[PDB]
Amino acid sequence: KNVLKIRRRKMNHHKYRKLVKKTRFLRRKVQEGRLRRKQIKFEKDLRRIWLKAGLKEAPEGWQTPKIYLRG
Amino acid sequence: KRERDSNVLSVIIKGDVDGSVEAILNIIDTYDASHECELELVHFGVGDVSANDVNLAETFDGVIYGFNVNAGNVIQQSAAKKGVKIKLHKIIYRLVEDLQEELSSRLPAKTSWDPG
Amino acid sequence: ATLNQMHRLGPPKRPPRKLGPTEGRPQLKGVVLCTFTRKPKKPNSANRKCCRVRLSTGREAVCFIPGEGHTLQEHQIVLVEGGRTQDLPGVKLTVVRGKYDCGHVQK
Amino acid sequence: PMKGRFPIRRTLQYLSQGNVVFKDSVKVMTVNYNTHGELGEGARKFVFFNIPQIQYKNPWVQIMMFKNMTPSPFLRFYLDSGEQVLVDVETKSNKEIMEHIRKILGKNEETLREEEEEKKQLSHPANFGPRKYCLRECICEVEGQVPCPSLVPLPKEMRGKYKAALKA
RNA sequence: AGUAAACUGAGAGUAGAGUGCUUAGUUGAACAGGGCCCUGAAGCGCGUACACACCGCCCGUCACCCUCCUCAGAGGAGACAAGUCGUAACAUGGUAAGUGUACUGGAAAGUGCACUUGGACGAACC
RNA sequence: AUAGGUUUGGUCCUAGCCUUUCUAUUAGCUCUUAGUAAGAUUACACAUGCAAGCAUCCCCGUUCCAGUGAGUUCACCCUCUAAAUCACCAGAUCAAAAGGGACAAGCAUCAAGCACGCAGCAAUGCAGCUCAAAACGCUUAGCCUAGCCACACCCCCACGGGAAACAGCAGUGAUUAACCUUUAGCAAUAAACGAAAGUUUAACUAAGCUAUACUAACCCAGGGUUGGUCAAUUUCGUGCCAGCCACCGCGGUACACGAUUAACCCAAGUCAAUAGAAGCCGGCGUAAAGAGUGUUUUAGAUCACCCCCCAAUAAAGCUAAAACUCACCUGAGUUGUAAAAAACUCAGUUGACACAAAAUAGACUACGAAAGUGGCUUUAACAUAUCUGAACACACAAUAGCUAAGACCCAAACUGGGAUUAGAUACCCCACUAUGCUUAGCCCUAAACCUCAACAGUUAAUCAACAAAACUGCUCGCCAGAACACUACGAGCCACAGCUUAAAACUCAAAGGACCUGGCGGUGCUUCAUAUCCCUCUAGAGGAGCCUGUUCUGUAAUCGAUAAACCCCGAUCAACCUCACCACCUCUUGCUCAGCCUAUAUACCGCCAUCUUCAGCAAACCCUGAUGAAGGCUACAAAGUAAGCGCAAGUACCCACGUAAAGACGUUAGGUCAAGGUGUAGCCC
Ligand code: FES
Ligand SMILES: [Mg+2]
Ligand SMILES: [Mg+2]
Ligand SMILES: [Mg+2]
Ligand SMILES: [Mg+2]
Ligand SMILES: [Mg+2]
Ligand SMILES: [Mg+2]
Ligand SMILES: [Mg+2]
Ligand SMILES: [Mg+2]
Ligand SMILES: [Mg+2]
Ligand SMILES: [Mg+2]
Ligand SMILES: [Mg+2]
Ligand SMILES: [Mg+2]
Ligand SMILES: [Mg+2]
Ligand SMILES: [Mg+2]
Ligand SMILES: [Mg+2]
Ligand SMILES: [Mg+2]
Ligand SMILES: [Mg+2]
Ligand SMILES: [Mg+2]
Ligand SMILES: [Mg+2]
Ligand SMILES: [Mg+2]
Ligand SMILES: [Mg+2]
Ligand SMILES: [Mg+2]
Ligand SMILES: [Mg+2]
Ligand SMILES: [Mg+2]
Ligand SMILES: [Mg+2]
Ligand SMILES: [Mg+2]
Ligand SMILES: [Mg+2]
Ligand SMILES: [Mg+2]
Ligand SMILES: [Mg+2]
Ligand SMILES: [Mg+2]
Ligand SMILES: [Mg+2]
Ligand SMILES: [Mg+2]
Ligand SMILES: [Mg+2]
Ligand SMILES: [Mg+2]
């Protein structure tokens, strides 16, 4: 067989890598914002859990770890 | 599509009766200040300002003028959301003063067209 | 696929029918915002008459204007049917003649 | 072609050939059989062929299977009264097993026919209704009776539009 | 090979007109063997994404109008379409092609490490 | 489906799209009658009128009927047992509430829900329950139609609030493409009431409007189409423009556009748009598809009964060849290659010398699940069964890459220099770094391909093509046109320019796999070129002047040829004429039963260039390919035979030589409308 489809995929992948290199900063900022919002959403989910369960406050000595942050 | 110039007032006309609608349309047709600002008549009808009138006004960044007609609360809310301006009136010369005010506002001053 | 696999997957989850330009409705009502011409894709050559309408559903679309000659000006109401114009890319609405402000072709 | 060996097993025409319809007391049927052993061949082929027929004819009896659990194959029917009927099936062909279960717990042809008579009692020919339940939607369909107006117009005499004129 | 070269006539056509054309004749040579690194021919092959048949086909950037998507404004895709720079791929496509991965670069892309044949190695010895 | 059209230069296969059929809504054009059926687009807002009374007062009814489809697994079966009817009773009928079971579509990029269970009399104890066989969640939908479920303006509910309610009939505003009367009667059936005659009923009956449909008719017929699928076009007008098409496509001087004629189909209709009816037992080497690898449970299957060693892996140790480095001696050069440059002063012999790599064996085909594994020794060691089975987990996963610490002979992205080029951010040369190695962690990707899944079995009657012959049983995994897309969003991850999973919008009629023929190849081998490709021989051109042709300039002043195959060419010929060109002047049935050297050599004849300094072209047969495009060759012969044309032969010249002549079919839409004729189009004082 010929490699026309492989060539199309090659061009697609090369252009994608070039675009990522060209716009890495904006992508990094957007990803950081997404991770922060993800953490906030998860914390809201846990808060919903206990508030619906009927606890005035998070269980004793509970603090939600920041699971989506590198540090 | 082409962007409409600032000196083009698009107007919807709504009347309580066909006679009032025709009177307003005759007043508009007497228009002669075309050079300074065009007066386009997007649509005219008899009855309360309706959702379709609001849609025309939104589509053409126009202004609805109602002559002795009502603008329900829902219609007012929708017009506010869509950025249209509904101006009800109960006197023909008051409506004409408002219309000349809008023409002057669109001008780059006071308009030179006169109704009589 | 084995009989067990067919049972597990169930019947063929057919794709839903996707609405065309007219939201799956025989006709729509539009207000001609602008009128212009479009060059058809090769090898055809022409200046096909088209207009831009704010369809009743709130979307704006380019409608082809059939027939030899027309008069559609801005602010006019037309009825639009489906059916793509084959030689115009991206145009999938035909202004119906003889309805509202679009009169029949003149002999 | 239909997948699987003996695709005839997966045809309504085949599953309707089952002659075994259990008495109302039968509730569970557990089939212990061995996947190997020349003596368990009858039970194996019974499970392969006739179990679909039995289940189709008896949609409420829980049929369960158990491979290589006991040295010899056997059927066990748990009835509504608490009784448990153990039927040894070693050395018996699938046809023999089917006949035996039909004899000991199946409904007799006369009882099946009595149920069918009860069923046919429902569809009274003289009743008029939608074709789903009745042979005729209206008396118009019966010849001799005044025909349906939609096909044969009624006389102006009978039509109420002109009875009104006669009233006037 | 009576060839090249040189030399001398005649004719067609004009009223006249060629250093032009056709044609007759005289003297009259040299090499003529190696080859296939160069161009074409033949035979057997091989490859081919070309079929208006390589003056083909075709890739990517840069600029231009539309349609859709994501997006605080901008990007991406597809389409229409011409130019622009190159010639990356299709023949051993002129550095075989490609996969993963990394660096680099106007732009197809270059190279590095490993892997595939979706290349060949002409198929006795020579 | 009885199928049909459409991918290509052509054939086969796969596949998508579309056509043909039948309904329903809307629109366009058109319409005569009678019977019948059916009828707002919208759970948006409503003027008006009516829609529930009966009856000796109490009671009963106004909870029914009628309406809508917003919501939505309260509808079905079983258990139990309310209400209601059987004049009181009887259990019978009917049927609520409650309990048990069943009960729509899509999305898993919704995979976790977060108390969703149990025991005990209670106290209280146990820590459980649902869920990849789809829980939890989001979106959509009235359904399973003698009819059923739900709602009754919204706040699920309706005490209360928002507020003042047609989703009862008729009707209206708004809205949509969607649009029926503000009719009569209780005469019939049904309901309510009464003891009953009876009364009320926009339920219902009988009427009104509407080609939405069916039936029937009239001695007043339209709509659509006419390139192919697909029934059927004459002449004009236009000339890639106007425009047409369901798909393929048409239009650059038209059976496809518009008009006109005619014909074809249906016909009081036609058929443009939309929607629906047509949708899983087919495939996975190359068309999408066997997931990089191995192992469970729950399960499924019957393949369970039948029945020596080589190169796996981890650790430890060791080293033969060759490098590097260091030492003696020698020498002035060494490396580099198509040729050079740059570069080092260093190079050769001998000896010592690794944490790098592992000739020959290997023409062996072994080990491991895969990735991988080929120097030597030792230790540990190569799961189980007489099956399959994981984004649903665990463990691995070449090379590259990241973090840290070491090693560094050699190689080597990057970088620099040299060279090359029009440019060379490369190919070629030199130096060097990350990196390749070790340790400990990550990363989890490969054309991870033997593109061919595991287990069992067969070679029997084959097989689209190619490839690695064709299949049977069983199980798991995966695929449903191309591109968007190894992408976006979501999710997970020691990943942070990443990996896995993975869409949709817009667009197209194709995309794609395998072959045949031809063209081409800076394509391989072999054999050749005989004035020919190179060298070789002779004489020239390219340098000078002149003649002449062409181009460019100029002019008022031709035209044609114009790469080989134009250029002393049409012309074996221009002062006038020739002359077709230009300027001025003159004529109009004109030399012509006119004329035109006006356009079209891309309509042609006619005569030719061209390969051709070729030997092939071949009708008609036959055969091979599964009867596809296509192919047809072996002489110690294997499917070719071929009339005819050409070559050849024959002929002229001076032989039988050589030179002439001849040179088929085709290519370059090669030249010539200016030899002449001619089609078409064009001027006609
Ligand atoms: S069906 Fe019988 S009267 Fe209509
Ligand atoms: Mg791309
Ligand atoms: Mg190239
Ligand atoms: Mg290359
Ligand atoms: Mg490479
Ligand atoms: Mg580089
Ligand atoms: Mg491999
Ligand atoms: Mg109609
Ligand atoms: Mg709904
Ligand atoms: Mg998503
Ligand atoms: Mg309510
Ligand atoms: Mg309402
Ligand atoms: Mg109503
Ligand atoms: Mg209305
Ligand atoms: Mg309707
Ligand atoms: Mg014509
Ligand atoms: Mg594939
Ligand atoms: Mg296993
Ligand atoms: Mg797996
Ligand atoms: Mg790895
Ligand atoms: Mg290093
Ligand atoms: Mg990748
Ligand atoms: Mg990604
Ligand atoms: Mg993401
Ligand atoms: Mg020569
Ligand atoms: Mg000269
Ligand atoms: Mg000339
Ligand atoms: Mg010329
Ligand atoms: Mg003269
Ligand atoms: Mg002259
Ligand atoms: Mg002339
Ligand atoms: Mg020619
Ligand atoms: Mg010639
Ligand atoms: Mg000759
Ligand atoms: Mg001859």
Ligand SMILES: [Mg+2]
């Ligand atoms: Mg020509």
Ligand SMILES: [Mg+2]
């Ligand atoms: Mg010419």
